[PDB]
Amino acid sequence: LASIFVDVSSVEPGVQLTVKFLGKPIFIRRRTEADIELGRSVQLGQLVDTNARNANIDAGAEATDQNRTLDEAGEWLVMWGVCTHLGCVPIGGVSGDFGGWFCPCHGSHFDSAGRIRKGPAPENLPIPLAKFIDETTIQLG
Numbered sequence: 001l002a003s004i005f006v007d008v009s010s011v012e013p014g015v016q017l018t019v020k021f022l023g024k025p026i027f028i029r030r031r032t033e034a035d036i037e038l039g040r041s042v043q044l045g046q047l048v049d050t051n052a053r054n055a056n057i058d059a060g061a062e063a064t065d066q067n068r069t070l071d072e073a074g075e076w077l078v079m080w081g082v083c084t085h086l087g088c089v090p091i092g093g094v095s096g097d098f099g100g101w102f103c104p105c106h107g108s109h110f111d112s113a114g115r116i117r118k119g120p121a122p123e124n125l126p127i128p129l130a131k132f133i134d135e136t137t138i139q140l141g
């Protein structure tokens with residue numbers, strides 16, 4: 001079966017793990033308290049794309065910070081590392097003007113929940129089928 005199983009036991013706050021799945025990067029960021037608070041401080045009305053783009057929940061779900069992470073605590077942000085404009089790999093480590101990712105191909109800025117805030121990309125970075133299957137492992141797909 002296609003599903004893969006990622007050990008995240010050693011991922012510390014402020015670290016992104018990048019894993020290849022279906023030929024493309026998946027970003028698994030363990031968010032800092034700053035990342036989480038900032039994500040939760042954004043009103044839906046401020047967003048370019050109000051859809052959660054999240055395979056795990058209703059396709060009409062709103063792009064609240066809570067609908068962008070795997071866990072209620074908001075520590076685990078898992079998304080395709082594929083810019084929704086033309087597919088370049090967004091640069092992380094708190095890059096760009098919105099405390100998240102910057103796609104250097106045509107200048108798209110994503111926030112700390114991977115939501116599009118500035119530039120040509122039309123959509124928030126999509127979230128794959130992903131869930132914890134115990135304390136230390138995320139199943140993708």
Ligand code: FES
Pocket residue numbers: 083084085086087088103104105106107108119120121
């Ligand atoms: S591919 Fe990301 S801004 Fe164009």
